[PDB]
Amino acid sequence: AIKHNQQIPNNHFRKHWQRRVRCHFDQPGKKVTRRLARRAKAAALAPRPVDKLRPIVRCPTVKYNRRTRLGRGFTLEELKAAGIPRLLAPTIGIAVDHRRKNLSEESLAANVQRLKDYKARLILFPRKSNKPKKADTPKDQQTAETTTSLRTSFGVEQPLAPGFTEISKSEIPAGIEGGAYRALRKARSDARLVGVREKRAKEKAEAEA
Amino acid sequence: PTRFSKTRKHRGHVSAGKGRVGKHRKHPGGRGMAGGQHHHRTNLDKYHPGYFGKVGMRHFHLLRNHYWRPSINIDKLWSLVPSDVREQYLSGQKKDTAPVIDLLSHGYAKLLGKGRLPEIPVVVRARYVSAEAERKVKEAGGVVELVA
RNA sequence: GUGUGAAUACAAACCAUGAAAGUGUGGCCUAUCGAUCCUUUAGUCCCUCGAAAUUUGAGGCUAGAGGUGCCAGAAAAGUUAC
RNA sequence: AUUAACGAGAUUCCCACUGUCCCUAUCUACUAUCUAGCGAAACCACAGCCAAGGGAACGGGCUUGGCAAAAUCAGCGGGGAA
RNA sequence: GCGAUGGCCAGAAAGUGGUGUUGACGCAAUGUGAUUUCUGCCCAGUGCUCUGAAUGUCAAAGUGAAGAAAUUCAACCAAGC
RNA sequence: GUCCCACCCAUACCCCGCCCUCAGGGUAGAAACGAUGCCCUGAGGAGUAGGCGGCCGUGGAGGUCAGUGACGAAGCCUAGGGCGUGAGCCCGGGUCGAACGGCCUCUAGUGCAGAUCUUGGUGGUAGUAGCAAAUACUUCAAUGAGAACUUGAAGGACCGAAGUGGGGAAAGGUUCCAUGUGAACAGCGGUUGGACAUGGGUUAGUCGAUCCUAAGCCAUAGGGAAGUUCCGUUUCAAAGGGGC
RNA sequence: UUAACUGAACGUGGGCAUUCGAAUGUAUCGACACUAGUGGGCCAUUUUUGGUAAGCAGAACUGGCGAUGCGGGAUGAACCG
RNA sequence: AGACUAAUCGAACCAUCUAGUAGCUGGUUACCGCCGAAGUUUCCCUCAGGAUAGCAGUGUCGACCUUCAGUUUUAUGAGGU
RNA sequence: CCGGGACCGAGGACCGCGCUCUGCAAGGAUGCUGGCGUAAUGGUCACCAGCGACCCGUCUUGAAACACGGACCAAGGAGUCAAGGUUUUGCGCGAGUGUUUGGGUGUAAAACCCGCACGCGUAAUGAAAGUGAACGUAGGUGAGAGCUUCGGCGCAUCAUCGACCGAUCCUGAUGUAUUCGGAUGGAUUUGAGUAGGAGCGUUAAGCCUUGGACCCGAAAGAUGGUGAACUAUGCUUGGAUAGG
RNA sequence: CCUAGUAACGGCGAGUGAAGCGGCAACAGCUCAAAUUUGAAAGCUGGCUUCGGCCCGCGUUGUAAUUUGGAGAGGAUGCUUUGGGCGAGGCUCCUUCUGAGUUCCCUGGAACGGGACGCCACAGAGGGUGAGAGCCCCGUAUAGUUGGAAGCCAAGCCUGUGUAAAGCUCCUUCGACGAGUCGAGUAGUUUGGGAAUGCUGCUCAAAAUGGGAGGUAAAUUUCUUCUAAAGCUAAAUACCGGCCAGAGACCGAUAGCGCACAAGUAGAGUGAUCGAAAGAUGAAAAGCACUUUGAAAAGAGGGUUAAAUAGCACGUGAAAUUGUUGAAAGGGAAGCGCUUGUGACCAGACUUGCGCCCGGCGGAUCAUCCGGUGUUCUCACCGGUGCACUCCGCCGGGCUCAGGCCA
């Protein structure tokens, strides 16, 4: 029953909503539990970091197309290029993505650089102390300052390419021959008429011959 | 705070300010938007003209990402370069360099043109551009490219 | 000072009549009629079917018709002396 | 449509009989009545004398008059629109 | 009304039941109300019942034609009316 | 019926005092002021439904009075006082026994005469209605504080064998017996009781149950149903019992 | 628009106040925002419709009761002050 | 006989949905101060009810703009009681 | 110009207007005297006396009503909370604003710090493909507080004529994938637009909607269970009823 | 969390209403069918055994190894990798132990109250003891300390070792991949899903670069992305039903759960079921000895206690309602408003203050100067001198002014 000028109401309170009301009165309490779990996890993994290396990835829509972010795992082709055994990779903390594939060559190049400088920064204790092997650490460059986050030490350096640059005058290029607004209009109309134009051309050639 | 509210000033007066003849019953008139076309038509026609009826075509499974292209005028274009570098250009001490502004990074897609512009050559990199915007940025001494 | 019915004075076109000035936007004036949704016809040669094309089909924009007489417009037979 | 027998079925008349009546009178038992013992309920704005007037057009209360003397027992069915 | 491969009736269904340890002098469904004397005319209306020569109407499936297809158009057509 | 003198009183008119509301002014080289204060001037005041402003009380929270109190806190009684127009606040006298207030902010399950309101308690009516079916009681003695309704003896009566007699099935569950007894119950009384307190009492080869089937109920073989479960009782089952 | 600088609207510049061109009042000027109650009315002088008439039914301008006490009509919501 | 089915029958009793809906009756708690109404227009299966306009309160803003007026005078129009 | 009587005495140094001018009846009362210094004046309560005074709450045009509820007392007792809107008041920042989904840390449900994204706002209009806001010192005219060198400049806002962007109807240049593109100029059309930004978060009040929704109130409807100890009908097994 | 009250559904009415992308919490990958070990069923339940094995049975209509699309099989080529046993030390659980006044005076039945003097504190949270106790008692704070059991994590050491098994780089060529299923028609239900999003019943019923999906029905020609009809697996998430623990601007005996108590008890119904009322003596029972009246219940004296104005009907004990005593009124109601009168009862105020003159008493000390300190820098304080017609306090007499009520 409207009485004055108001906005037409629509409040979806017509079922028995009172039977399903969730209140978050334990927001601080949960936080404490999560922190206790992290410390326990950190103590179990004594000298290793907590997280696992992720690759660099570009967002998948036309919007958000500009930014980059972390992925889920490295593709099988990326691992082979860096020279890493397929099965040893998960053990030493590098992840693996069963179902991603590389179409271009910049993401491929970016990720192999990531692996290469990681392997240079990786220590590797032997499986038994009394018998070291050839691929282990020689026990003398084995004491150094370590990291544990591996998200801050290996996060995206810059998601968005630098906003602006500077160039000397008389080096600025020239636009498209006729304008840059006529270029868009022409490129649009061409795709609108692709079907009709090709059909008309084809009929004339066959009919004449 | 309930200690100062008009219900505390009604104590002692029978009917609590709701009237003796019309007694504030439960739901006289119907619940919600009932009677829109029958007894509430006067309200729905003095206000909200356009409530009833159908218009336009429908569109199955709309994805809002296909239609993302925020705009920016041409008089706010100079506000995209930091303040210290900006004052050096407008004051006139460089004379030999031109800034290359990239709208896409700062979160814009189309460069409309509404205001004026100072006579300093720039270089704009946009996805879309308007006819009036192109003319003004060109007569200042610069050019606009298409980047996709 | 909402809608429907009806009416008045101009504007831009194309016409009728008269030698001409002029007159003519239905019946000399006061009554003779109809919303949303749906169906159907006329118009451009127009927009869309959202991976890309071509022809069928369907959906859109503007103007009429199918009707509500309880006529600002629900789809509707009785009895109770239990 | 008639119909013998049957009926705590409805209706009319006749003989015998009577307090149904003219027209009322008397007698007996058990209460009511008084005392010792026991001992409730319905109901209740405040309460409780009338006549006329006006008023929501039939007052216990208002206006104008009549009047008006403590505390109480057994009956009665006008009123308290009981 | 009914000769059991059946009539009347129960059940959500069933290798389920009642009439039925039954068979027309029987079972089931209705109306009038001892005996005596009788029980007239109306099949237009509403019902019930009977035979399919008649083609009038007519669903799904099936048949024929057009179209590149979705689809459209035609005959044929059981019971009931 | 007409005319003429004086006189009587409304919350109306005039003058004065006081309250509030509204409006207009003055007040810093500050010897100055809850400046939200003080001083000067003018007009006005009715009110249901309704709107707004200011103040007063209750239960809790933060701060502060270096607050009150077993030499008496809270509560309750009081034709004993003071303040405010008012909701209310403060004191005197009596009773009582362990906690409680003032000020500025925060907070709410925050103020009662009604709703044939809810729970609990108490009145008038009122020592009133009444304790009237089934024929009925009386004399002496004993116990006892106390006798119409306790016991003994003697009279007078009723039920009148389809009984107010003598025994049982269902149902009841210690009501049966003895000894003793304050209050409560026995719509009057009570030494009496089917009431109260303490103890005791029900013996089966022959009386019953246990055994057999009737109307009927339920397992098994099977088939339905999503399922709790419905049908099925000799049925489309390889179903037993006797001897040495 | 007219045969036409002939008109029509909007304008530049200048002139006319010595007295801004009837009375009275200005104890109340203009605009905006959000919202409560109400949407059964009744009475009276004058005008007046249906009805034999009514403490009947229905209208127009204004004034009252409802929402209001006080003095008078002995009493009485509407009458006089 | 609408009779009986545990003092209940023209559809038993018990718990839950369930605080079922009501344009309809009943109630709705301290004080003072200032302002102060309507029963009327249009629409609704509208007539015991709603929306809409009107009457009312509060908050302001623009000037103190000097404008206004339920009135009179003077000049000049319309009406069919 | 002379008498007679009644009610009142506000204010608190001078300042003023004046006159009959060693002073005054001129911007508000002083002087002399008597009795008593306590129940005397004054106050509270009970009663008699003169005048006045119908029972509260409610619906209603109209209530003291022969309209309804109310015997009495004590305690309980009714516009609340959440989400979403809107206008107004206070506050912070301001073309931006918003830490608390989360992380770091902690005297630990407190307090303090951190940033990528995201929401609202900064740009509209069409059904849509799409397009997308300056001729002028951001225009002209009439008013406008304020300022002013006195000539003038003129904020907010009101009225009016214009300019620009999107939609609709016409017009159709240079060009050319010869059928594509839509420049320029118009139109009693249309928009919740531009024309030197005003928003975001939070606090308090009024109002609106959905919710049990100010509190108490139906005759009905549905899901799942319990009853034939009364009564109805029937089956199995028993019993009972003078004398003429 | 945001997308989003959006696309969409809807007598297009009331109303209903998702998903992709983005930031964060938590992260973890894998096994079967389809192949001939065919130069050796290499596999497994049960029984007996001395621990080494044996026997029957299952099974060739297929039990182990090998392979699961990321691939893999088959070939070359050279490299690399793989077993056991100890184990300091650390982390969980229970249990031993922990600082300081009962000092002095007053009120009180009893100090835990008031006053004076002390002490501890990584401990001043809470409770008890005859009233508000840091130091009377239990506990409270911090890291060690007494003793014991079972597990985990783990620095680093001691030991074997091949043709058994595993990993990487290249390749001509091969490369098995789930059926009454997928799909279509039709019917019902449901969803925002619209010429039909999922599910189910009936009819028809496939293929090998095949098949599904690409949000508008159909034909023709391209493109993109995965590989169904077999299976397993922790963490971020829900919950106060079960066992325990810690807390609150919550309620305070008609409130808070129906139940603070012998409460799902007493009680009602044939039954399913319905379902209450009821907390507090005093610090300690010290719960009234004995005399006397009475048949007894009980009363009166006399006792305990700080109090019996706490006596098992017990803290405090209001109103409705009742009794006694005291005062007053009443000719068919009472109560109430304005104003006197009588009677009873009662709060205030006044009972002196200031000033001057004369006489007496007592005292240290008025003006002025010098030294020191502070401060608003010109106004004051302290120390000394100052010694009677100066100053101060009191008493006696006299005088002016003012001060209560009615006139």
Quick description:
Chain A: Residues 140-152 have a biased composition (Polar residues). The structure is cut from a larger assembly and holds chains A (209 residues) and B (148 residues). Chain A has 209 residues and is mostly helical.
Which range does the strand content of chain A fall in?
5-15%
Tell me, what's the shape of chain A? extended
Note the run of SSEs of chain B as H and E. HEHEEEEHE
Shape of chain B: elongated
Let me know the largest β-sheet of chain A. Answer: 2 strands, antiparallel
CA-atom Rg of chain A in angstroms: 30 Å
Q: Main β-sheet of chain B: number of strands, strand sense, barrel status?
A: 3 strands, parallel
**Measured distance between first and last alpha carbons of chain B:** 57 Å
The span between the termini of chain A is 77 Å
The main sheet of chain B orders its strands as 1-3-5
How many helices of chain A? The count is: 6
The helicity of chain A comes to 25-40%
H/E element order of chain A: HEEHHHEHH
How does the helix and strand content of chain A classify structurally? Answer: mainly alpha
Quickly count the helices of chain B. Answer: 3
Residues in helix, % of chain B = 10-25%
PDB class: ribosome
Keywords: thermophilic eukaryotic ribosome, 80S, rRNA modifications, nascent chain, ribosome
Entry title: Thermophilic eukaryotic 80S ribosome at pe/E (TI)-POST state
Chain A: 60S ribosomal protein L13
Task: Outline the structure in words.
This is part of a larger assembly, with chains A (209 residues) and B (148 residues). Chain A is mainly alpha-helical and 209 residues long. Chain A has helices at 27-44, 76-82, 88-91, 106-119, 182-192, 194-208; strands at residues 56-58, 68-70, 164-168. Chain A is extended. Chain B has helices at 41-46, 83-91, 131-139; strands spanning 71-72, 97-102, 110-111, 123-126, 128-129, 143-146. A 3-stranded parallel beta sheet of chain B has the order 1-3-5. The A-B interface holds A 1-3, 5, 8, 61-64, 66, 160-169, 172-176, 179-181, 183-184 and B 27-35, 40, 43-44, 47-48, 51, 65-66, 68, 80-81, 96-102, 104-106, 121, 123, 128-131, 134, 142-146. β3 (164-168) of chain A pairs antiparallel with β2 (97-102) of chain B. Chain B binds 8 RNA strands through α1 and α3. Chain A: One of its GO terms (cellular component) is cytosolic large ribosomal subunit. Chain A: Residues 140-152 have a biased composition (Polar residues). Chain A: Belongs to the eukaryotic ribosomal protein eL13 family. Chain A: It holds the Pfam family Ribosomal_L13e.
